Design an enzyme around this catalytic site. Structure first.
Site, mmCIF file in Angstrom:
data_model
loop_
_atom_site.group_PDB
_atom_site.id
_atom_site.type_symbol
_atom_site.label_atom_id
_atom_site.label_comp_id
_atom_site.label_asym_id
_atom_site.label_seq_id
_atom_site.Cartn_x
_atom_site.Cartn_y
_atom_site.Cartn_z
ATOM 1 N N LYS A 1 -5.915 36.508 -43.878
ATOM 2 C CA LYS A 1 -6.321 35.214 -44.411
ATOM 3 C C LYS A 1 -5.422 34.817 -45.573
ATOM 4 C CE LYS A 1 -9.783 35.001 -41.538
ATOM 5 N NZ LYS A 1 -9.505 34.447 -40.196
ATOM 6 N N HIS B 1 -10.039 31.910 -29.824
ATOM 7 C CA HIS B 1 -10.746 32.310 -31.027
ATOM 8 C C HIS B 1 -12.011 33.093 -30.575
ATOM 9 C CE1 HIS B 1 -12.422 31.968 -35.112
ATOM 10 N NE2 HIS B 1 -13.568 31.715 -34.502
#
Lengths: 373, 373, 373, 373
Positions: free
Chosen positions: B159, B291
């Protein structure tokens, strides 16, 4: 995990009693090429393709069949993908036979295999090859159309662009006066025109209230010309019957070229690719009405596909597109026993394709193996 | 055979021992909502969705279940489309359950139901929620990554965008020095940035050789900003995990916004719409990498779907995109007994989904009905 | 429903001890024009505008004031709208005074009037008019910048485009060597360049890591040139300080011309229009950093506006744009007692504007009424 | 003063005596969800949202209320933005309640809070759910319309697209013959159509002089289809009632998709975001006419907002757009005692919202907690 063990081929040929045609010229014969794939278990499946028979028959006997023998019938996506590299039209036929096998082994109909139908009735339009080889072609066309209107067809397709605008208009006028405004009329140009020639019809489109669409007014070399024309006409523009698959539709839809796309099960890369064309249209917000001029078994698959397609509109009574129904002399319409009733087809619900191939037709029209001018 | 007679629900909840997160904040718990649809014949199937449990539970028990009881399980397309109006998330779980039932009734696997797989193994990347609530968050992330690299993951996602560029670069640099260039690194901004903020990474993308893609750098409000940014970076750009269906991807792809789309089985309208997302990408010539951050049973469907997807390139050993594999604390990863080895997941080949839901996990993590946060 | 009864005007003028400037030339003086609107109840409000004083003073005494007397102070939108037709810059000043009145009558701060702040601290950059009338202008600029860096400013803006590229580069180089890379530097061209001239900076932008943005490289006559340049540079492009309102930004943002817009409270049609510019930027996904070179009371309103603006990013430490802080000789900075501390301004929280106008400044700098070369 | 101490909730439900609807189907009931936020000082305010009540109620009682208790009521922007993450609908109701509190605390009306109104009366159109479950639906609609015309409505909106073009044209023709050209008629397709289906109306739009606009002819998936269709019709095109905020309108307006936008206070992120929608339209030079079909208290906010909106044209008596007024059976129209006279609504001028919630209606229609459908 049941292997393919045997495949039978049925090239079919029929010389026409009276020739007919469109802007490309007169058709003198009709052909069909059937395949029957048989598995180790005895479960079998039929497919249909249409192409020049000498070349098509060797494509199967010399390359496709030897490939398919010993293969897993269930590996449909993979097998159809690889055959597409040798002959696309053959690939569609194989995809049909393998789908039939799958549905039968699953003990369900094809629509069920696909996740269930939305409906069991599909509208059809009567599709005419309006030109004939006679000074009296307009009166004969009028008579032919009248005959089918008696059968309860409410929508028709006829040909334009084969002769001068003035003469085509005389033909269309004659049909308007017989059919009247409760009959929807579709005009097929078979790519005869450029933008300016196509546009000459607009003065008539301004007056008529019963024009379904204008079909393939232009060739597809210049997608921008379609976008241009669409925005100028007062009726919807349809086309794309010679597109090879979803990838070829994508840029026509990105450019807002067409109101209606018209994939043909037999021209695209098989039935799963065909269903993807239909869904693509839904996702782009555009209509889809299958081309099916030369189909019978393939036409039934287009009907199954339409039955499994979500509505295009929120109109209770006008939310599914019709499929093309050839009404010209053609004994292959009877390969499957399914016909419209008052412009509507009821989908067979039984296991596999819910119907049988008519072997009388298969036998009567066996191709004699000779070259055919 | 397939009339639906009973539907069982399993809201599940797990408080995290240690929170972790991304640029949107820290996750404090994980949840899962499983459904088991039971037909007249005893054939059953499972589905999974994820949403705030108090509202999700009432949606099933008060609207969705009462609607489904008595319906024909084989009318999958229709039923999913109806449920999609009240609750998209719920429709996704319903679609999965009905697919398992269909495959079981057909006596085949889900992949065979779909026309057979192209391949038996699918690559995955280790997905990390890199931020922790600690001044020592960078060292922790480094340790966490090293742990997973030991399991033979060759690709990771981490991230960015939750703190200043300078500090995020420190984190990534630390990871680069430990993992080195053999490891593919995916950076996920979770829509934190605008184009100029995202573009700051380019000077490092100029040096690094091992960046897989830049994920969700921007919000999707302005599609043109994606096309703009795409043409400026030295790495592919991926996103679209919150797109609701193929129709939402169409304009993004027409505008050349993304190198990679990232549909989520649980965020789109069911497994058939999900598969249409992947097909759409192929027809547009773009890549597709699902995803799957939440999800275990839905993750299995994403893997089946990827096994049935044709290759994206002609590279013998680099022609299928990886799927996301959450590697953070999450007991729901075991709901289905399937794990990667050396960064590859072998697809279950057995009838239905080829596996059983782990009832030990289902029972252990029963949601106690209390509202949280 | 409390009427306007009296309005006082304060044209202010200050001759500069040492002239300074930008690409447009040297500034020799600074001016300010304050207004104080007094209502029937005694509640009063201040406004500020900047324009050529002879013309500005008659605009107020001969037209605006006679209009405003006897009007309802609360009809802010309407009154500011109508005055905009006579003098836009005056309209901004009126909008400020009326906002102060409103907040006071509501017994709250201005930020509260607007629905409450998101934060109470706003970053500022030190804004320099780098050119002076000396062969030694580079060394003086270096000394001036050093002085402000001592005060803890971490971001600066300096001028370029007033002299040859080679000479500007020498200046910027000198500043880089003193400030170092932990200081963010902004370069303001004041529309000196065309695309090709602006682009010459790219070779330096390729090397530097501390360039905040390039400001107003080009005039705005050809928005497409901005879009062109933006896509070629390695740093963000800012501008728009002479735009008159949201309507003028709209097409620049639709065309992807700028990373950062820079409305000026005093150039747009008052404070509500100014806040609309900020929101417009947020909705378009672009940044907003107020121009405020000539402001003090107006600058405080820009700070209130920034305090009520949602974050532009998800970065915990980098999610609100700085405002411009003039650091050149200018006694009007003290009109309100508010100054940065280490590059940060803390927003007054009290009722109305939470501070008082410094009457010593107002009195000391009363304009003598004469024309001023 | 304004710390939030208590929040009361009022889910409300009404089963329709006779169902009515649009192209999406028949409505069987009406619902409303009111909230009353009470502060430490006793100042309170009301909000309204509409959604499926079982899920909405749990969202408030279990997440939203617990979050708000103890918070400062004056931090409206912040609090609404936080709630917008869990529930947009809920955030809208919260925004309204906090606005009433703000105005009350400020001792002014909501419009004065916003800077004062431009005007005291706003035009409305009678909005009909034209379809009924009856072969006699056309005659019924005619009677319903005539009834409202007697009340001096000069503008109506009715539904199209739920049945065939031919039948919808019959309905509209019947209305045209009864109402005549003095009455402005708005046709609402509720996204039923594609461009070609919508364009069929053009031949009637060529004849009629009294069509206000064509509403939501198409779904919004393909913005370019709207721009295309707009340039072909002889009447304005309106829509966007399901857009979630100003950022979603931006691309539609940049692309010249619509003549009129139709934000809904209850569908966007609160009253401040709603007002930003209207401002955005003005800055883009497009019209704005609020969707308000559900809603009574939220409808009042839409009217306040329209009273504070500058004119769209320079036409002395045609420069402010109307707002939607539901004229179907709905007891919640009386929640606020405000009704149009002769098609005009006079805006309440008193402190806060200038009116009281009718507790008789609130009590009469208390939702009994049972799930419906």
């Amino acid at each position: 995990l049941v292997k393919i063990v045997r495949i039978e081929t049925f090239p079919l040929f029929h010389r026409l009693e009276k020739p007919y045609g469109d802007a490309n010229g007169f058709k003198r014969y009709r052909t069909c090429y059937l395949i029957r794939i048989i598995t180790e278990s005895g479960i079998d499946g039929w497919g249909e393709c249409v192409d020049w028979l000498p070349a098509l028959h060797v494509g199967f006997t010399k390359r496709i069949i030897p490939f398919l023998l010993g293969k897993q019938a269930g590996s449909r996506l993979s097998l159809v993908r690889t055959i597409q590299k040798w002959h696309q039209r053959a690939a569609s036929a194989v995809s049909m036979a393998l789908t039939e096998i799958a549905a039968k082994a699953a003990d369900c109909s094809v629509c069920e295999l696909w996740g269930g139908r939305y409906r069991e009735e599909i509208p059809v339009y009567a599709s005419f090859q309006s030109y004939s080889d006679s000074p009296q072609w307009i009166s004969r066309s009028v008579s032919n159309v009248e005959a089918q209107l008696k059968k309860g067809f409410e929508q028709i397709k006829v040909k334009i662009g084969g002769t001068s605008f003035k003469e085509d208009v005389r033909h269309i006028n004659a049909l308007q006066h017989t059919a009247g405004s409760s009959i929807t009329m579709i005009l097929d140009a078979n790519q005869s025109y450029d933008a300016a020639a196509a546009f000459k019809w607009e003065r008539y489109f301004s007056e008529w209230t019963n024009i379904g669409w204008l079909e393939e007014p232009l060739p597809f070399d210049q997608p921008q010309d379609y976008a241009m024309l669409r925005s100028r006409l007062s009726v919807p523009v349809a086309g794309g019957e010679n597109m090879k698959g979803p990838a070829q539709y994508v840029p026509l839809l990105s450019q807002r070229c067409l109101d209606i796309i018209q994939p043909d099960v037999m021209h695209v890369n098989g039935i799963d690719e065909f269903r993807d064309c239909l869904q693509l249209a839904r996702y782009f917000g555009v209509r889809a009405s299958a081309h099916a001029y030369d189909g019978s078994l393939s036409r039934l698959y287009a009907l199954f596909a339409q039955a499994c397609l979500p509505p295009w509109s929120k109109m209770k009574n006008d939310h599914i597109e019709p499929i093309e129904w050839d009404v010209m002399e053609n004994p292959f319409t009877d390969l499957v026993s399914l016909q419209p009733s008052k412009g509507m087809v009821h989908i067979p619900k039984g296991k596999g394709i819910g119907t049988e191939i008519n072997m009388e037709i298969v036998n009567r029209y066996k191709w004699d193996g000779s070259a055919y001018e």
